[PDB]
Design a protein around this ligand. Structure first.
Ligand code: 122
Ligand code: CA
Ligand code: ZN
Length: 223
């Protein structure tokens, strides 16, 4: 997260860290055995780390659970990043409490102007790499589709939306990939892509979760 602030320990209880010997992506806990992340975060050997604040220190509240299976959306296109969503089933259920909680899936899509909270342990530099020890937060608004499409002509599908600032300086970045964009307590987006990070006129692009609610429910119901 570039230009964000320290969330505060466990203030984002649905945030998870996907780890393979280091933190490589974020995700959101949507129930005690399933996490939603981005398809471009796929790899084998994933350990999901819940209740984290400092990812380099065991401070208490952490629960480390291995992923039993990862389900990349069948129509995921790694070249356009269309359908950039993945579901991870945990080997055992997480113990939910005030520090580890699930976030609700939306019933309707959010409108341009809705203010959302994006969080993660991704890079904090737009120029350079600095990855933080504790979770970073950023409040950002969903932009209009005309603004999004004007910034990324021909690259925005109906399964994406832009959120952020056009002046630059505040954005999610690599490492934040797969993490949550929560608006009015509903998970509306997944950190997906953008041209660099926090560059002017190049807002972040997010997977539009409202378009996948039935796919998520059906998939979870059959696995
Ligand atoms: N600016 C942004 N909002 C953004 C967010 C997530 C990203 N994840 C990447 C990314 C780029 C190349 C290879 C792996 C990545 O996870 N770039 C990103 C950019
Ligand atoms: Ca920790
Ligand atoms: Zn990424």
């Amino acid at each position: 997260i570039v230009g964000g602030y320290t969330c505060g320990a466990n203030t984002v209880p649905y945030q998870v860290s996907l780890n393979s010997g280091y933190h490589f992506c974020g995700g959101s806990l949507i129930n005690s055995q399933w996490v939603v992340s981005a398809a471009h975060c796929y790899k084998s050997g994933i350990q999901v780390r819940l209740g984290e604040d400092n990812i380099n220190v065991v401070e208490g509240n952490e629960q480390f659970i291995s992923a039993s299976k990862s389900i990349v959306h069948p129509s995921y296109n790694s070249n356009t990043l269309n359908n950039d969503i993945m579901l991870i089933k945990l080997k055992s259920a997480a113990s939910l409490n005030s520090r580890v909680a699930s976030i609700s899936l939306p019933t309707s899509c959010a409108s341009a102007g809705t203010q959302c909270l994006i969080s993660g342990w991704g890079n904090t530099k737009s120029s350079g790499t600095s990855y933080p020890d504790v979770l970073k937060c950023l409040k950002a608004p969903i932009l209009s589709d005309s603004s999004c499409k004007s910034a990324y002509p021909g690259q925005i599908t109906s399964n994406m939306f832009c959120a952020g600032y056009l002046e630059g300086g505040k954005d999610s970045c690599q490492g934040d990939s797969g993490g949550p964009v929560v608006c009015s307590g509903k998970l509306q987006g997944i950190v997906s892509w953008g041209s660099g990070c926090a560059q002017k006129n190049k807002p972040g692009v997010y997977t539009k979760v409202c378009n996948y609610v039935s796919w998520i429910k059906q998939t979870i119901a059959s696995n």
